[PDB]
Swiss-Prot record, chains A, B, C, D:
It comes from Rotavirus A (strain RVA/Monkey/United States/RRV/1975/G3P5B[3]) (RV-A). Pfam families: Rota_Capsid_VP6. This is Intermediate capsid protein VP6. Ca(2+) binds at N266, D286. GO terms for molecular function: host cell surface receptor binding; metal ion binding; structural molecule activity. Zn(2+) binds at H153. The N-terminus is blocked. GO terms for cellular component: T=13 icosahedral viral capsid; viral envelope; viral intermediate capsid.
Amino acid sequence: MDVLYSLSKTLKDARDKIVEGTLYSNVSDLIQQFNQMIITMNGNEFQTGGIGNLPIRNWNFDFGLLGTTLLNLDANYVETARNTIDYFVDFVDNVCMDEMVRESQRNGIAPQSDSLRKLSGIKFKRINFDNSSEYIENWNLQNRRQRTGFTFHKPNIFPYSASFTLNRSQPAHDNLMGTMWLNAGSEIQVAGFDYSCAINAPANIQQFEHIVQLRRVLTTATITLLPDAERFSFPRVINSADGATTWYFNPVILRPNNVEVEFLLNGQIINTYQARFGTIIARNFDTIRLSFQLMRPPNMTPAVAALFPNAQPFEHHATVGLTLRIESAVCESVLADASKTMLANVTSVRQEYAIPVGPVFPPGMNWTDLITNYSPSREDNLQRVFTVASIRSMLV
Amino acid sequence: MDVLYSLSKTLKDARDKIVEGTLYSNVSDLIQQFNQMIITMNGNEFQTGGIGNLPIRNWNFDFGLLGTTLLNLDANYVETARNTIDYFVDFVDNVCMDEMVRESQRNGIAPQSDSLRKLSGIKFKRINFDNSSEYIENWNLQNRRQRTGFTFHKPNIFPYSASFTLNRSQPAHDNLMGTMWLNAGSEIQVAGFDYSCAINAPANIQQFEHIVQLRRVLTTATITLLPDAERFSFPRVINSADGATTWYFNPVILRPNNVEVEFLLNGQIINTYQARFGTIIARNFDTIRLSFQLMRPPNMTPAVAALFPNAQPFEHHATVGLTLRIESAVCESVLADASKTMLANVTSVRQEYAIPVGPVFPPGMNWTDLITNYSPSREDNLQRVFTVASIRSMLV
Amino acid sequence: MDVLYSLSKTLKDARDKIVEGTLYSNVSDLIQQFNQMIITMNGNEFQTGGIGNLPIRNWNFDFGLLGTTLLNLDANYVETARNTIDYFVDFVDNVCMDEMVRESQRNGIAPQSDSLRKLSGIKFKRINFDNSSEYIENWNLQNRRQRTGFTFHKPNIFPYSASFTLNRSQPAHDNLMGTMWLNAGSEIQVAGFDYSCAINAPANIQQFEHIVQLRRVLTTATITLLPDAERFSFPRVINSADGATTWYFNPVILRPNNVEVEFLLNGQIINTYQARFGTIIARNFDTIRLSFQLMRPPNMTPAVAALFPNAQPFEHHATVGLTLRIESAVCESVLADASKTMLANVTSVRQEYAIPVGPVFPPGMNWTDLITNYSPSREDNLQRVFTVASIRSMLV
Amino acid sequence: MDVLYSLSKTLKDARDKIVEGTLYSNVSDLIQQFNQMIITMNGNEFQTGGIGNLPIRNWNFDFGLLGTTLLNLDANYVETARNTIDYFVDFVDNVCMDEMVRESQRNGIAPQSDSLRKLSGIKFKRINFDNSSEYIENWNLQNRRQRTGFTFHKPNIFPYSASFTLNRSQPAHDNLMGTMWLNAGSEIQVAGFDYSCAINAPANIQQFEHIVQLRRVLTTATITLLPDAERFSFPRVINSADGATTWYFNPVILRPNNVEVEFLLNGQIINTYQARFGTIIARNFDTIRLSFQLMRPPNMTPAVAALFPNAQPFEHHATVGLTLRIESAVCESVLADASKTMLANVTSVRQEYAIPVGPVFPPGMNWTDLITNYSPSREDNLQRVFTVASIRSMLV
Ligand SMILES: [Cl-]
Ligand SMILES: [Zn+2]
Ligand SMILES: [Zn+2]
Ligand SMILES: [Zn+2]
Ligand SMILES: [Zn+2]
Ligand SMILES: [Zn+2]
């Protein structure tokens, strides 16, 4: 991996720095690294495999060294370098693709394709140089069993789940009490709905709770918390839990009362926020507990007082919402997020060459199914393919 | 462009690296590059700014070099460098502004201002060194006609469009079947509404379709697909298709049925997702085709049964919705996006100096018009000014 | 491409210049170029492939150089040169055919045949010399991302379409208002027909508008615009839009009123011609808007007044016309035209060897389908095959 | 003109021939010519533009020669040559645009732009070499008082004119005898109509004549003559000669009788074609006389006999026709034609830079007005701008 990364980094530096007219002192170290790469690679045969529709490709390296002895790089130099660089970039791209489409249940962190296994030999260690990218740096940390850290903007930590729980219900679904939620991406929308508007509650207060168990720990997470859930604040016809019938939802939104957001780690309270909206920092947690309340308004103008009668039928159901967005966070594991392209790159490569589903990942690299069952073997394979994808994206 | 980028990169490196106390071996190559820049620019006269209110500015270079044999940089050295750095930064900013406010129909990729045309001379090519930024890398690859793409977080690929289509209509607008959509930025919110709830539709299923043709191909795109459209889920009074009368929309949201997303390229099915929500990957496409269906719930509770009568009047209108957010993608052409400042920078420069409208871009650099009619010439000019804006933002 | 073109150009020069009795000084430079080609090709094995019915052919080059000893070329010299040239022409023609019958969706501009891929290696660059053909010139300019130009006499820019639009219609088809058009090749014939002769029009004016979107931008275009549309000026029996019935058209031709021809680029008005007929120039456009009017004659002689009653039935339907021929134009993309034979050569080669339909071109090389869906991939493949067809037509 | 053309031809040869890998013997003479151009242009300041919206541009020439010795051209050589060529091509394009937008009543053949007047000095005559194009060759032949010739495919020799003459008429416009014609470009459709069908004409024959005077003599003209005129063979509501009223035309086409096409020079008959249709050759003529007779069919069938009564009213009007198309001709003067783009180039350059109407040409370079009043001064200016446009086309 570090050798593949160093090949790609050398090629990217060569493409960016070996340009016409440049001073040789700008590229001296790059020229030495490039020549070391050529020397290490010369004489070696590689085969990038025929998994799926990925074509079988054969690679032979017999290249001359890049010249020294120029004060400024000229067009001849750039042309020779470009020929060599183009061939090397094609090879590295094919190696990255061949690695991206493979997986093993056990030892899934180890290289899978033949070319990357060959490149893991001692003889190629000479190629290795500056491992500065986030993914390669975390790869080296993981190899050394050190703390790993990935920074995500809008981490895709929640699998898609649009569900509801009815805490009070009956076959006619006209006096219902419960909660409905959408967890997706970095966003949670939850809403506690009471059809009776807490007329018969002990203090006219209906408590609502929502626990989301993150499948990986997050740290240094900045989170926007907003009082209402726009997703569950308009009239809906919702299937019954067993699918037999449909019930009706006619929300009228009251401001949530006694909002209590707890960020928990291993069943311990780390962060607590009461009646706080806007940005909050959850420094380290694996669970989010939202406790809100519908407090029946003690005073109601006639227009308001009409909507909440003492008894049934209840036509305007009192709903209190909450929206929680994880804007950015840090996780020790690789995750899909809004800004990066690793998951999309891996999925695209798997789809383009018709890679059959393997024994590690869900078909189509479906992220909901992946992160619902984010097993350690899946974590290793995903970190591997994502590091390879990031190495590829440096050149392609 | 490469020379202007190299000037800006040299100035940025001089600001960052030529600092008090630093080992000369940290800065030797940079000092050499800086001195080569001084030597190349010395004795050359430049004129920037004769357009709009951008004032005429003349630039002369007679600057001394920087030493090459001390061991650690001291405050004297930094003071010697800083005045030259300031003059050069001013010159580069003015060259960038001069280029940003200019356009041409014939060769929009070619330089337009006098100063950048002079900097295209072979003698200035010695200034050229590490072209490592995404925009300059894409510039160099595009000059060679190599495959290269820009990576966008939330690309602004959709021109603003809030419209509706009625498949069933009549002058009173009380039994309407059709679709309403917002296309904005990287977001598509679409909603199919049936006022009769497909009471008389075959199989009680009403099919809605929505096709969005992207002006440029997106690759390796991450998409969030949610099953509701919060934008079309509340009562609305909407103008008629000719603006003669206003009709009423009173949605009640049913979950969309048989949800299908087809990402297509040149009319071919590339990606297909059925009943999939959350994160999906579209590897290569120019068109998004969303097919969804309103299905009457065969079993309704009494409130739900009341909502939808067998015949008119229809007061609660059955609506199904989809929301599609392109979180990240890659495009071979430049685009505005939520992360970068290139479009904003170019617009700000054009507005601050009252640049007359040219023959390439819409007035005021309006993005909706520009992306609606994103022609190859407009793409050329936009890539030029966006690369210049990125070069300018390296120093300003 | 440049190498294959240079080979063909050398062979053509040799065929035209190596003739009995000619001074050696007439051919000295040509002999040097030819011997350089012999030196470069000697020892290289080529295979022209077996796609479709094209025979697999193997090519071995072990030729001696052409002599330099004669003051005037004799018959023996011409015969030896003829033998070598015949083998080389056979090879170049086979390579061109093998390239023309192949296509790619990913990189359709890049060589597809194995021999043209081998000829792209650096070792063959010595062969490369004068690139003076319009197609090779455009190829080299495009490789450098320079403004390309293809000049077309009667460009085939309009896909074949004979259609009509009825703005007013009824099931009996006797009071019809609308337009009928033929768009074919470089010609547009449009005709607006009103059956009531605008008897009840707001000012006795019936407006017709025809919008034709060109698949590519045309420049420096010479266009003949004529008042009448001879194609829609005789009695016709026309299928209904659904093919259920046939209606009757009995045109009587009036002079079009307020003839306004707009040539638009990016929806902006570039050229406007009002009441102008004959030759006009459209400098740069991609859309044509033809707006014309059937104006009821304020005064009529008794026969004319008899043709047009005040109410139904209507026997003589007032038709106005417009004819628009593009005689010459310039396009940045390749196109079929009335003079060049590139499309016909590519189609003939594909049909002669029964090339299976591929993933780029329509399944006959049919031009209407191709120009209708002129995608960037299609344009790339078409430019490649048209350049190869021009290179082939230099020899065959 | 010869010097500007030599500059452009040198630049075009340099672009086409100075390519990577080519033998130096392929370019030696070209390298010498290019170096001579550099020597002659060195130390000279030029100014272009300053008219309309054409920008002022200053050009200073200080370039070195190409003295490098090589067997084959490398990238360094090509890049140096390319820098010089790009500057020179921009200069030549600007000089051509500057000359194309200018006119003078006196000495309109002579150079008008200051740069071209300076280039006419003796010191620049060294640049002059091969003058092989049709337009520059004709320019030189004319300067030598030798007979020049421009070959035209479909010469635009007829100004647009859709007219009619009534030889017998009355206010009712129901018993009309006369002719109607369209003279457009290289096409002439003419039709003689008699409403009485020559019932009372002497010998039952009605004679029609049509004289078209060409503004310039044509030679070696290939003409297609067809019996019928499809443009005047459908029902038509035509305007009155004064425009007061409208008359009705209901053609029934009879074959023209005693067809005689006379091609005349100075009123003498050069070519005569009697009852000959298809391709004919008019070797040298300035006038065309079409004489054709409507001969009443002596023997009719009842359906035919019913169309032609003895007296008014006349419903079916007997029309004979002729179509005359000049496919190719040769003119000593310059003309627009179907295949070339010189007129379109000049018009485009004048429109793009908003050139005010001058004292020689009509507004917008309208070809009908220009060719209707094709005066000697107009002819001189037109040849100048067309030669300049042909020189510009070689590079742009
Ligand atoms: Cl965001
Ligand atoms: Zn239920
Ligand atoms: Zn974001
Ligand atoms: Zn409506
Ligand atoms: Zn119809
Ligand atoms: Zn009259």
